[PDB]
Amino acid sequence: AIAPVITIDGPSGAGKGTLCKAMAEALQWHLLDSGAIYRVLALAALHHHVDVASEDALVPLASHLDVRFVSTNGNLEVILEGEDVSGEIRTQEVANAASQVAAFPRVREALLRRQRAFRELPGLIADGRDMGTVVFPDAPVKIFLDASSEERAHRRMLQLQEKGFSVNFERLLAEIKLVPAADALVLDSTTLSIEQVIEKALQYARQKLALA
């Protein structure tokens, strides 16, 4: 501890990514995207020819993972060993290798330690599913972002469109149809606009970490 950490947990498509980036840029703090972490490990393995099925080989790789996340104008750059790999990480191939890598207990443990090492001054914004419950249970500010099925389905639709696939909203609404920390601030992405969620998250963080 010592360096402040703001955790953002919630289901897929709730807007965590957007909130996380906006907060990291507003406060100019470090950023950690746990969801992308496994894909980056998987890509490093493929790049270095580390056997995706060998737990023993994957652990050292995970423990020394050279990754950093940078957000500019809401655009996320994933720098693995000096090069931006944001595009590579979005492929199904990497997504599949990420599932293989994530299956091993010792690999998940090593990645747990590696994620905790992102906590440095002036601060860290971290988003995922268990950031405030498992990774940083002592985080001074914890936020749980919830959203309606429609909001989540719409966000998913736009995310796929980007990869080139345009899919029926009704189909996705069906496709989509995680415990908040006891000390988390609960924010609903559907009662408030995303701009309002960011405002309210920043105000809460300020009352807890600064102001006066």
UniProtKB/Swiss-Prot annotation:
Gene Ontology cellular component annotations, sorted alphabetically: cytosol
User: What is this protein for, i.e. what is its function?
Assistant: ATP, dATP, and GTP are equally effective as phosphate donors. CMP and dCMP are the best phosphate acceptors.
User: Which residues bind ATP per the record?
Assistant: 10-18
Keyword vocabulary terms for this entry: ATP-binding, Cytoplasm, Kinase, Nucleotide-binding, Transferase
Q: What's the Enzyme Commission number for this chain? A: 2.7.4.25
Report the locations given in the UniProt record. Answer: Cytoplasm
Nucleotidyltransferase among keywords:
no
Q: Output the Gene Ontology terms for molecular function.
A: (d)CMP kinase activity; ATP binding; CMP kinase activity; dCMP kinase activity; guanosine tetraphosphate binding
Task: Write out the GO biological process terms.
Answer: nucleobase-containing small molecule interconversion; pyrimidine nucleotide metabolic process; response to X-ray
Supply the source organism for this entry.
Escherichia coli (strain K12)
One Pfam family from the record: Cytidylate_kin
What reaction is this protein's catalytic activity? CMP + ATP = CDP + ADP; dCMP + ATP = dCDP + ADP
Signal sequence bounds: none
Report which superkingdom the organism of origin falls in: Bacteria
CDD domains attached to this UniProt entry:
CMPK
* Protein name, per record: Cytidylate kinase
Record family assignment: Belongs to the cytidylate kinase family. Type 1 subfamily.
